[PDB]
Amino acid sequence: KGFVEEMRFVAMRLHTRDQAREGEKEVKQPEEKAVTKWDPSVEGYLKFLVDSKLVYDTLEKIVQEAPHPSYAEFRNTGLERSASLAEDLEWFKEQGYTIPEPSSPGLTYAQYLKELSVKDPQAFICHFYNIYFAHSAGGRMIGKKVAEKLLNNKALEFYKWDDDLPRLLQNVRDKLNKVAEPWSREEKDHCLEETEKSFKLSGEILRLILS
Ligand code: HEM
């Protein structure tokens, strides 16, 4: 039975019920409240977008270099976001905003991903799944609400895909199921146990929006 379903179960229970129907956590950090209650700023959102771009650039470099050969299965999935973020940062530059340097949440996550990618493929796969699949789920609703609050409803490229998203996602889920099928139970469990750290490091990047 498909291992992605196991990763999704763990991810959902780590959401707050404010923010997702299947979430089981209480609101503890900002950002963990329902998005409609957020008070974002453009300054904070730009830090979030720059730090996000650093993480996506890092994930793209890891699957191209493929220090473990299974990572090459995840090249060119259609979910890559670095080009879309570059376009959106240029839109903000054309509007007169300053683009910030990467902040500590993105620098920290990028460094950790590079380390994991070499030493711990099971833990890396947990982050690959949670980072990309978070974005195409709640990330889209964050983008829409932030654009309503601050951008007069501008629809940024970060929230657009060149192909049907349900099919893109399902084909990556089936690739993830295939890379995990030879794993032992212990390797699968090790992957699942990494999910809290992905939520922590991602959450610190999301919190920039509200900073
Ligand atoms: C402000 C924060 C967040 C909100 C509002 C949010 C909201 C949601 C919602 C409403 C869903 C269910 C809809 C769906 O499956 O398409 C979902 C799914 C998901 N979220 Fe989040 N989420 C947040 C943060 C995170 C974080 C930090 C992670 C992990 C780093 C994450 C990982 C996932 C995953 C993996 C799914 C399953 C998506 C799928 O099955 O394709 N989310 N999220």
Residue numbers in the entry: 16 to 226
What does the paper behind this entry write?
Heme oxygenase (HO) converts heme to carbon monoxide, biliverdin, and free iron, products that are essential in cellular redox signaling and iron recycling.
In this study, we have determined the high-resolution crystal structure of GmHO-1 complexed with heme at a resolution of 1.06 Å, which is the highest resolution for an HO structure reported to date. We therefore adopted the iron single-wavelength anomalous dispersion (Fe-SAD) method for phase determination and successfully solved the structure with refinement finally up to a resolution of 1.06 Å using SHELXL and COOT. The heme molecule bound to GmHO-1 is sandwiched between proximal (α1) and distal (α5) helices with axial ligation from His30 residue, consistent with previous data from electron paramagnetic resonance measurements. New features of the GmHO-1 structure include the shorter α1 helix and an additional irregularly structured region continuing from α1, which has not been observed in any other HO structures. To accommodate this novel irregularly structured region near the heme-binding site, the α7 helix (corresponding to α9 in HmuO or α8 in hHO-1) has become a curvilinear helix. Interestingly, the back and side walls of the heme pocket are negatively charged in GmHO-1, whereas the other HOs have positively charged walls.
